Amino acid sequence: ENVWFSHPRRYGKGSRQCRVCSSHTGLIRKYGLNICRQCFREKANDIGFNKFR
Amino acid sequence: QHAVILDQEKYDRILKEVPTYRYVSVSVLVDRLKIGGSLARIALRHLEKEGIIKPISKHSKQAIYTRAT
Amino acid sequence: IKHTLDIINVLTDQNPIQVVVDAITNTGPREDTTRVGGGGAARRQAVDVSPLRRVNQAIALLTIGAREAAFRNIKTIAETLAEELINAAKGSSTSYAIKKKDELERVAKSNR
Amino acid sequence: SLVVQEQGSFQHILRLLNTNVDGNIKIVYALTTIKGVGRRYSNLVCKKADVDLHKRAGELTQEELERIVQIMQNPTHYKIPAWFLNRQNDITDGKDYHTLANNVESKLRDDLERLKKIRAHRGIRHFWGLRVRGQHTKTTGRRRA
Amino acid sequence: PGVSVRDVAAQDFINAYASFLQRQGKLEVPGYVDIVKTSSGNEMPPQDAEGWFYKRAASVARHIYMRKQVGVGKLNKLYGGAKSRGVRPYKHIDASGSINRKVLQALEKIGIVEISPKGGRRISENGQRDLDRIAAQTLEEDE
Amino acid sequence: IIKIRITLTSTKVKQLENVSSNIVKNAEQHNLVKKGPVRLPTKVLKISTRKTPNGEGSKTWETYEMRIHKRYIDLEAPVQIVKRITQITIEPGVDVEVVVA
Amino acid sequence: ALISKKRKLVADGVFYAELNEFFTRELAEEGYSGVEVRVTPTKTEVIIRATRTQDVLGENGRRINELTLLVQKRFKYAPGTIVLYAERVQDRGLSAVAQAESMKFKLLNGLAIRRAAYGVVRYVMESGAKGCEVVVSGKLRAARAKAMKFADGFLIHS
Amino acid sequence: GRVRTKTVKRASKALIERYYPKLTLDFQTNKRLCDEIATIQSKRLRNKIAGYTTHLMKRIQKGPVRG
Amino acid sequence: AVPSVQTFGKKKSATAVAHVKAGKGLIKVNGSPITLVEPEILRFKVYEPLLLVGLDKFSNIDIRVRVTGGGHVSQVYAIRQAIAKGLVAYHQKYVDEQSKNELKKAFTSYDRTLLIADSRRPEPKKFGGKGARSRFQKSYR
RNA sequence: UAAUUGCGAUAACGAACGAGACCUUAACCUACUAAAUAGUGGUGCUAGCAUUUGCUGGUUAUCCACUUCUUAGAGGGACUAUCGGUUUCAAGCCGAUGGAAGUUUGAGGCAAUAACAGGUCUGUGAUGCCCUUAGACGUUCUGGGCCGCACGCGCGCUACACUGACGGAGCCAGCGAGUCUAACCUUGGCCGAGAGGUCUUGGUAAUCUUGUGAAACUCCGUCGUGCUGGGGAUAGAGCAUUGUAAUUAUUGCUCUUCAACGAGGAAUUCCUAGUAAGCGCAAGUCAUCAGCUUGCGUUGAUUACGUCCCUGCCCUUUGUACACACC
Ligand SMILES: [Mg+2]
Ligand SMILES: [Mg+2]
Ligand SMILES: [Mg+2]
Ligand SMILES: [Mg+2]
Ligand SMILES: [Mg+2]
Ligand SMILES: [Mg+2]
Ligand SMILES: [Mg+2]
Ligand SMILES: [Mg+2]
Ligand SMILES: [Mg+2]
Ligand SMILES: [Mg+2]
Ligand SMILES: [Mg+2]
Ligand SMILES: [Mg+2]
Ligand SMILES: [Mg+2]
Ligand SMILES: [Mg+2]
Ligand SMILES: [Mg+2]
Ligand SMILES: [Mg+2]
Ligand SMILES: [Mg+2]
Ligand SMILES: [Mg+2]
Ligand SMILES: [Mg+2]
Ligand SMILES: [Zn+2]
């Protein structure tokens, strides 16, 4: 309800963060992952992404 | 710089050097006689309209003509 | 190529494939020159040419001559290739192909 | 069939609106060689003035040439659209103009001077001679000469 | 013994149908036919000014015959080309929707194409009939 | 007697396969017409990203793939038989959805 | 719902990863090994395989039902559409995550690196695997870091 | 090139050692034999086993070998 | 009735499905005559089969080809196969083995393999280069 | 041998990792299972022309039949098969035939030991220690900056033209992505030169966007060796879209301005077949912005089938005053 404490973040970076580390750089938004690429590399084997070729 | 209109001296020339050689083309006309290309093409159209040259093939990029017989 | 062989037929009544064969035969470079280490001036020694390399260098010379003689001209690629093929069929010291052949032969007979 | 049998009335380079207009090239591209006017506006001018498109500029003589020049000066009266001109919704009048051979340079310098006198950043950049559109001069713009 | 626009060549048939539409003349062209570039991907207007719109009409009529139903978006995608963006690489940019729809509704007001359900425009009865008869005269143009 | 559609999908090919074998088996001992399963094109979820956590090293890329396999079968069955199929045939990972129309 | 099957399956994968991270964070003491989402419409089943499942249903199911409430309100399901189950993990010795948890416990207690790692590797080899290795690595004795590799048995790599 | 490895060589030598009367001179029959009397888990590897086995059969018919 | 056979012809991405039946003897692609396909100089490439064997053996056959995928050269080289394999399949199924065989001898004597397709397939592209084998230009300085 | 890959030799024997094997993908299957969310043929109804049977089409509740093409799942297929040479005549190699495939079939994925005092505390609620911790180096708001330009380098994109530019017509892909408590991909109709706008529609997706009707190309025409209709930088004016906000122009469009560049010096990069190169398209970042990257398909050459000369690499022997190791 407080004024003077927010600026419009409804588009672009800042409005979107990584859902594991609240980071704004290097997001993956394909298929609605909303995770950074490094975390994605860590949790891909548990999500279900397996490299084949 | 070339001649792009016919002053009737190029006209009666090309009428009198149509038998002189065999292979008629745009570049042949340009090199034998100083015509700036477009009139050479128009002259090819006029000569195939009344053919004392006959066509071998008529592609756009190049037209190949020789003498009537 | 179809336009070129048509121009070949218009210029001369003989077979255009025979013209191509005669051109390749008359511009195959009989004697090339290879490289030798040769401490100092890093020498070159004359060496004969296998027939496939003859044919390949012949076709390459013909097409490079047509390219450079019809880069910026009124004359088209078909006309330039046809006149080069005619002069290579009758070697008249006018084809770029036979000029490169002749310089290859003279540098080979000098460097042997 | 379009061979022309005229002998004497063809002419070499000619004059139209303070410019040396070439006489043995096509009429639309000779109008293009006139400054302040390009290929598309030239082609439109010739077609709307019913001037023969097919050939060069030796004939297509006087009376059609003044038809050409008057539809160049007053385009808006002869169903030439307002967006086809180079300077529309102007500085201080709002009526649509087409600038020609000298007026194009004179009026580009004039509105550059207008923005210099209003002391715009655009004026400051045009004064220093740098790239006034948003461009990176760190790596390009070398050798201005 | 059996005639179709598939059985006649494309360029020839298109020239002859353009000449037929020239000889008839009932096309009610828009006033800006000399203005346009036929696409934003062009830079020069069409050269043959007296018959470019009628050639477009012939091509569109043949297209409607060849297909089931298409619209102005399909026509703009077909008649578009490569846009020269200067030093940047070329891209495919669609054609002029205004002249595409003008020639479509002109063919409608002749009676060659009509509105087809689930959206679209499809070939008409007399349109298929007169395209087939001019396909005939182009087949028996031989001396 | 209602004509419904059952659509299954998963990422693991073998458990999807024996789910489908169970389904076609049960439909075949209780035949309706025959309705062998129809196999859709496999959807390859392709995600390509850099190997490096930082921006140093040789520029090597990697492509993770998810594979989505999806089948449908049509059944024209009464109420309780539609039910008993839909609660008896169930395995981990395979998501099965039933639609009346 | 009305979600494409593509995004629904990848969201199920993200759901599984979040359960794994959750249960590793709170369920560390009793040796969490692996969760499996036995998805069934109308009450999905979530099986937790852990070592001390007495120490998940410790006092009359207390912490198991507060974890149930936690996962419930975290993932916004209707109450009663998810229930956790517990399993002893058969072949508890041949579990790499359980071995890592046990070695973490020993190093937090203060056992020597060599002693704890030899205990872990010998325990795996006597439990009945075909190969085992432990790559504890870091500042063990001095400031500079060092890698000690304890490999006993038979290990493929490709 | 086409050099065969220790897996196929050792396996084929064991097969020709203890299954000489049953095994034939033809690749197709010999690979059906290998499929039935060996619980090999790879199709290409099985084909390699049978091919080298056929090669050894032809060499045995030609003359005595030391291996 | 309708003694027809279905054959196919592939190049890199073009599939040409040829319906080959006993009829009056017409040969058509996409509902249009072969004399009207538009690769311009490859009109003879299509005719190659019809020509080689001889028009006679087609004076009783109606073939209709439906074509999908791949650019124009892929389109034409596929017709060639279909109007040759559909031919070979029809002479297999309905007429004498010596006739089918001598057609095979002519086809493999002149062949650009024709009856068999090309195993050349576009290999995948690798990172670090805009091409499949070529890599980005490095600098060292 | 691509390979400490094998044949063999033998104070070594028996093993292990790696390589290979393996997995994915691209090729073949008119053999199996199938399929209005992929097709095909016939049947009805219907449209043209020819009419003499026919040819080209359209048709969702017109059905019937099938799976060749399309998708998959289960399998099969190639193992260098057969033959001829060559080799202590062994491992193998070469040529030909057959074959969809005979450079470990092609391409990848994974990929050992030991290290680097390689990069990264700016991915991490991974972190020890130090610093700061309330007029904070926390966080937030307003406005700038990361773009600033005498210059020097590195990836690239346009080009320096007729094997071309333009103008018409012809006309063909594949990988993929897409909206729920949101507002995505948009068909179709209409307005507009154009960008774009508006009214609807379909699609949570083999169904709809989308046959992504892509571009290079093909044909017919204009131009014409002229820095020219090549080239489109630098400029001025206007019209739109996204966004709270575009001014150091976000981009898009229109008109006008029309510069260097005439094939590039020393040097230097990549590449052996559907590869190079040309050509576009999709996705990623994304409210808007591709000249970038990651994939995809279209068109598709030349020249080797070698050598250790340059640059390096592996093994053995040898020399060493080197061991932070020839910097
Ligand atoms: Mg076009
Ligand atoms: Mg280009
Ligand atoms: Mg490429
Ligand atoms: Mg029907
Ligand atoms: Mg042999
Ligand atoms: Mg491999
Ligand atoms: Mg870090
Ligand atoms: Mg700020
Ligand atoms: Mg920066
Ligand atoms: Mg780089
Ligand atoms: Mg063009
Ligand atoms: Mg497609
Ligand atoms: Mg230009
Ligand atoms: Mg993008
Ligand atoms: Mg930006
Ligand atoms: Mg970038
Ligand atoms: Mg010494
Ligand atoms: Mg020392
Ligand atoms: Mg020194
Ligand atoms: Zn993250």
Tab-separated table of N, CA and C (backbone and C1' of nucleotides) in Angstrom, chain C residues 52-53 56-57 60 63 67 70-78, chain J residues 160-163 219-220 224-226 262-263 302-305 309:
chain	number	residue	atom	x	y	z
C	52	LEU	N	45.215	-37.364	-66.221
C	52	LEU	CA	44.090	-36.752	-65.521
C	52	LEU	C	44.419	-35.337	-65.063
C	53	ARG	N	45.639	-35.112	-64.581
C	53	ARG	CA	46.037	-33.755	-64.225
C	53	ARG	C	46.118	-32.856	-65.455
C	56	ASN	N	42.429	-31.958	-66.116
C	56	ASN	CA	41.929	-31.058	-65.083
C	56	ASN	C	42.486	-29.652	-65.253
C	57	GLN	N	43.799	-29.541	-65.475
C	57	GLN	CA	44.398	-28.231	-65.685
C	57	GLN	C	43.909	-27.601	-66.978
C	60	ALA	N	40.406	-26.218	-66.179
C	60	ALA	CA	40.576	-25.076	-65.286
C	60	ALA	C	41.096	-23.853	-66.030
C	63	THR	N	38.209	-22.337	-68.200
C	63	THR	CA	37.171	-21.620	-67.470
C	63	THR	C	37.706	-20.359	-66.794
C	67	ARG	N	36.346	-16.598	-67.491
C	67	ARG	CA	35.995	-15.742	-66.359
C	67	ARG	C	36.663	-14.376	-66.448
C	70	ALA	N	35.643	-12.217	-69.444
C	70	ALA	CA	34.285	-11.698	-69.446
C	70	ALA	C	33.867	-11.227	-68.063
C	71	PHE	N	34.813	-10.731	-67.264
C	71	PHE	CA	34.423	-10.076	-66.020
C	71	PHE	C	33.656	-8.781	-66.279
C	72	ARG	N	34.297	-7.781	-66.876
C	72	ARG	CA	33.652	-6.489	-67.120
C	72	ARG	C	33.687	-6.206	-68.616
C	73	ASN	N	32.696	-6.731	-69.333
C	73	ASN	CA	32.629	-6.586	-70.778
C	73	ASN	C	31.179	-6.666	-71.224
C	74	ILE	N	30.935	-6.202	-72.451
C	74	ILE	CA	29.642	-6.429	-73.087
C	74	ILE	C	29.449	-7.914	-73.368
C	75	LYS	N	30.524	-8.601	-73.752
C	75	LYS	CA	30.445	-10.001	-74.148
C	75	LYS	C	30.071	-10.889	-72.969
C	76	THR	N	29.204	-11.859	-73.233
C	76	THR	CA	28.705	-12.744	-72.196
C	76	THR	C	29.632	-13.944	-72.017
C	77	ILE	N	29.343	-14.724	-70.970
C	77	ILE	CA	30.173	-15.875	-70.622
C	77	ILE	C	30.131	-16.913	-71.729
C	78	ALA	N	28.959	-17.103	-72.340
C	78	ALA	CA	28.824	-18.082	-73.412
C	78	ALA	C	29.679	-17.711	-74.617
J	160	C	P	28.303	-5.466	-56.369
J	160	C	O5'	28.911	-4.158	-57.037
J	160	C	C5'	30.071	-4.230	-57.844
J	160	C	C4'	31.157	-3.326	-57.334
J	160	C	C3'	32.530	-3.546	-57.941
J	160	C	O3'	32.686	-2.880	-59.179
J	160	C	C1'	32.715	-3.415	-55.587
J	161	A	P	33.071	-3.708	-60.496
J	161	A	O5'	32.171	-5.013	-60.399
J	161	A	C5'	31.836	-5.745	-61.563
J	161	A	C4'	30.538	-6.488	-61.387
J	161	A	C3'	29.794	-6.809	-62.668
J	161	A	O3'	30.376	-7.850	-63.465
J	161	A	C1'	28.288	-5.865	-61.115
J	162	C	P	30.163	-9.428	-63.216
J	162	C	O5'	28.784	-9.714	-63.945
J	162	C	C5'	28.558	-9.182	-65.241
J	162	C	C4'	27.333	-9.764	-65.886
J	162	C	C3'	27.510	-10.122	-67.354
J	162	C	O3'	26.746	-11.278	-67.667
J	162	C	C1'	25.849	-8.442	-67.136
J	163	U	P	27.518	-12.627	-68.053
J	163	U	O5'	27.227	-13.604	-66.834
J	163	U	C5'	25.957	-14.228	-66.703
J	163	U	C4'	25.810	-14.968	-65.397
J	163	U	C3'	26.047	-14.154	-64.125
J	163	U	O3'	25.156	-14.627	-63.116
J	163	U	C1'	27.458	-16.025	-64.124
J	219	C	P	15.842	-19.997	-67.728
J	219	C	O5'	14.583	-19.338	-68.440
J	219	C	C5'	13.619	-20.137	-69.149
J	219	C	C4'	12.290	-19.427	-69.184
J	219	C	C3'	12.302	-18.053	-69.830
J	219	C	O3'	12.181	-18.124	-71.242
J	219	C	C1'	11.134	-17.948	-67.776
J	220	C	P	13.118	-17.223	-72.154
J	220	C	O5'	12.315	-15.853	-72.262
J	220	C	C5'	11.044	-15.779	-72.932
J	220	C	C4'	10.237	-14.616	-72.407
J	220	C	C3'	10.833	-13.234	-72.611
J	220	C	O3'	10.647	-12.700	-73.917
J	220	C	C1'	9.975	-13.408	-70.417
J	224	G	P	20.628	1.965	-71.607
J	224	G	O5'	22.196	1.725	-71.621
J	224	G	C5'	22.960	1.961	-70.452
J	224	G	C4'	23.988	0.883	-70.242
J	224	G	C3'	24.847	0.540	-71.444
J	224	G	O3'	25.864	1.512	-71.643
J	224	G	C1'	24.094	-1.448	-70.411
J	225	U	P	27.183	1.248	-72.526
J	225	U	O5'	28.235	0.737	-71.450
J	225	U	C5'	29.626	0.969	-71.617
J	225	U	C4'	30.373	0.829	-70.315
J	225	U	C3'	31.807	0.335	-70.457
J	225	U	O3'	32.611	0.912	-69.431
J	225	U	C1'	30.568	-1.213	-69.170
J	226	G	P	33.529	2.186	-69.762
J	226	G	O5'	32.701	3.416	-69.181
J	226	G	C5'	32.369	3.475	-67.805
J	226	G	C4'	31.304	4.505	-67.525
J	226	G	C3'	30.792	4.567	-66.090
J	226	G	O3'	31.593	5.383	-65.248
J	226	G	C1'	28.964	4.571	-67.621
J	262	G	P	38.500	-0.127	-55.208
J	262	G	O5'	38.559	-1.412	-56.144
J	262	G	C5'	37.375	-2.026	-56.629
J	262	G	C4'	37.256	-1.914	-58.130
J	262	G	C3'	38.559	-1.857	-58.913
J	262	G	O3'	39.105	-3.141	-59.153
J	262	G	C1'	37.038	-0.220	-59.725
J	263	A	P	40.359	-3.672	-58.306
J	263	A	O5'	39.686	-4.471	-57.107
J	263	A	C5'	40.458	-4.918	-56.001
J	263	A	C4'	40.365	-6.412	-55.819
J	263	A	C3'	40.895	-7.236	-56.990
J	263	A	O3'	41.739	-8.347	-56.609
J	263	A	C1'	38.598	-7.764	-56.580
J	302	U	P	33.330	-31.299	-59.211
J	302	U	O5'	34.649	-30.417	-59.080
J	302	U	C5'	35.135	-29.659	-60.177
J	302	U	C4'	36.240	-28.718	-59.765
J	302	U	C3'	37.564	-29.367	-59.426
J	302	U	O3'	38.304	-29.711	-60.572
J	302	U	C1'	37.058	-27.733	-57.807
J	303	U	P	38.899	-31.188	-60.710
J	303	U	O5'	40.060	-31.240	-59.621
J	303	U	C5'	41.139	-30.317	-59.654
J	303	U	C4'	41.832	-30.226	-58.319
J	303	U	C3'	42.345	-31.533	-57.740
J	303	U	O3'	43.585	-31.928	-58.295
J	303	U	C1'	41.192	-30.333	-56.068
J	304	A	P	43.927	-33.484	-58.477
J	304	A	O5'	44.680	-33.871	-57.130
J	304	A	C5'	44.009	-34.612	-56.126
J	304	A	C4'	44.805	-34.684	-54.849
J	304	A	C3'	45.006	-36.083	-54.293
J	304	A	O3'	46.097	-36.765	-54.881
J	304	A	C1'	44.214	-34.685	-52.581
J	305	C	P	45.901	-38.255	-55.441
J	305	C	O5'	45.387	-39.083	-54.182
J	305	C	C5'	46.223	-39.289	-53.048
J	305	C	C4'	45.440	-39.769	-51.853
J	305	C	C3'	45.123	-41.264	-51.849
J	305	C	O3'	45.233	-41.782	-50.527
J	305	C	C1'	43.112	-40.019	-51.720
J	309	C	P	60.888	-33.573	-43.173
J	309	C	O5'	60.568	-32.438	-44.241
J	309	C	C5'	61.585	-31.564	-44.698
J	309	C	C4'	61.036	-30.205	-45.052
J	309	C	C3'	60.284	-29.475	-43.953
J	309	C	O3'	61.145	-28.838	-43.029
J	309	C	C1'	59.074	-29.329	-45.983
